[PDB]
Amino acid sequence: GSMAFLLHQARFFTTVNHLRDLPPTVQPEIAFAGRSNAGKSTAINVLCNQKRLAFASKTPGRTQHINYFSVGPAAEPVAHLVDLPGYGYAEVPGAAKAHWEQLLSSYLQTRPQLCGMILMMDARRPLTELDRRMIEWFAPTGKPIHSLLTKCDKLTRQESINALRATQKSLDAYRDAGYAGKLTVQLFSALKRTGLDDAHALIESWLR
Ligand SMILES: [Cl-]
Ligand SMILES: [Cl-]
Ligand SMILES: [Cl-]
Numbered sequence: 001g002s003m004a005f006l007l008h009q010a011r012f013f014t015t016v017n018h019l020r021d022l023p024p025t026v027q028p029e030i031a032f033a034g035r036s037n038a039g040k041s042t043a044i045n046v047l048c049n050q051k052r053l054a055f056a057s058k059t060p061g062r063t064q065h066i067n068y069f070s071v072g073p074a075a076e077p078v079a080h081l082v083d084l085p086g087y088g089y090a091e092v093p094g095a096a097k098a099h100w101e102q103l104l105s106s107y108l109q110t111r112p113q114l115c116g117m118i119l120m121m122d123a124r125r126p127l128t129e130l131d132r133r134m135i136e137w138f139a140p141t142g143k144p145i146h147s148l149l150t151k152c153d154k155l156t157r158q159e160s161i162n163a164l165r166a167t168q169k170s171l172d173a174y175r176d177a178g179y180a181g182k183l184t185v186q187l188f189s190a191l192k193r194t195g196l197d198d199a200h201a202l203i204e205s206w207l208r
Contacts (some may be wrong), residue, residue, distance in 0.1 A: 001201050002204075003156060003200045003201070003204035003208070004049075004200055004202075005205070006071050006072045006078055006079075007047055007048045007071060007200070007203070008048050008049050008050070009070075009071070009072055009073055009074075010044075010048040010050065010053055010065065010069045010070060010071055010081065011053075011069065011070050011071055011074040012053065012055075012068075013067075013068040013069055013070050013074070013080065014067075014068050015065040015066065015068075016065065016066040016067075016068065017063065017064070017065050017066065018201065019103050019106055019107065021113065022066075022107070023068060023080075025068075025077075025113060026078060026113075027071075027077055027078060027079045027113065028079050028082060028113055028114075028115040028206075028207055028208070029068075029079055029080035029081065029082050029111075029113050029114055029115070029148075030079065030080075030082065030114075030115065030116055030117070030203065030206060031107075031108070031114055031116070031117045031118070032044065032079055032081065032082065032083050032117075032118050032120065033084045033117055033118070033119050033120065033134050034084075034086055034087075034119060034120035034121065034131075035086055035087055035088050035089055035120075035121070035122075035128060035130060035131070036086050036088070036120065037060070037085065037086035038056075038086075039086075039119055039122075039150050039151070039190070040054070040083055040084075040086060041054040041055055041056045041083070041154070042043065042054075042056060042190045043118075043120060043148070043150070043175040043188070043190055044069070044081060044083060044092050046190050046193065046196065047196070047199060047200070048069075053068070053069065053110065054067075055067065055188070060104060061084070063096075063155045064085035064086075064096075064100070065085065066082060066083065066084055066085065066107075067081055067082075067161070068083075069081040069082075069083070070081050071181065071207070076143070076180045078207070079171060079207045080113075081185065082114070084104065085100070087100075087130045087133075088130075089128065089130075091130070095204070101122050103199070104134075104137065105137045107111075107135045108134070108141070109137065109138070109140055109141060114143065115143065115206050115207070116145065116146065116206045117134070117138060117143070117145045117146075117182065118145075118146050118147075118148060119134060119135070119145055119146070119147045119148070120148050120150050120188075121147060121148070121149060121167075122149075122150055122151055123149035123150060123151055123152045123154070123155050123159075123160060123163045123187065124154060124163075126147075126163060126166065126170075127148060127167060127170055135174065135179075138181065139179055139180070139181070140180075141180075141181060142181045143181045144178035144181050144182040144183070144184070144206070145181060145182075145183055145184075146184045146185070146186070146202050147167060147171070147183070147184065147185040147186075148185075148187075148188035148195065148199065149163055149167060149185065149186070149187050149188060150188050150189070150190070151190075151191075152187040152189045152192075152194060153189040153190055153191055153192045154194070160187050161163050162183060163187075163204045164187065164188055165185075167185050168185060171183040171185065177191060184202070186199070186202075187199075188196050190200050
């Protein structure tokens with residue numbers, strides 16, 4: 001059936017933390033990217049209508065990981081969801097900074113199966129410097145980025161509109177510079193389940 005149904009069949013597949021160890025999967029995958037692991041995990045559970053899929057209550061340790069999730073039946077998946085690690089708001093100095101820079105840029109630019117990126121940004125504070133870097137890393141691919149302005153229930157109606165238009169304007173600058181891939185945006189609220197049908201429809205458009 002629907003993209004909703006397929007999403008709801010989701011299950012955890014594997015974790016991954018080096019470029020060479022990405023699963024050799026046939027199917028297309030979507031990447032979820034963002035400063036917040038909290039918001040990512042919460043977005044994945046709501047899109048799949050599950051309580052306990054995306055590691056929502058797991059306490060960050062010393063290391064980070066990509067996580068893969070079958071879409072459709074786990075025995076016979078029709079896609080994967082790739083939760084890329086939250087870069088937060090400042091970058092952690094140390095040998096793992098380089099590692100993750102190389103990994104993510106090479107993944108974004110050359111992972112054959114990757115058909116697009118969902119970029120999760122707090123509506124109150126869109127488009128940080130690290131958000132911008134994920135955009136620029138994806139540039140050469142000509143692949144799309146859909147931006148979710150998250151926690152949109154915390155803004156007034158006017159403020160949310162203002163945020164849509166501000167992000168739109170920032171995204172156009174990229175197109176005007178020559179950015180090949182399609183840049184879109186919507187409001188999104190995990191808590192109030194806002195923007196969910198639009199989020200499903202976009203995903204369906206990419207995967208099928
Ligand atoms: Cl978020
Ligand atoms: Cl690490
Ligand atoms: Cl949200």
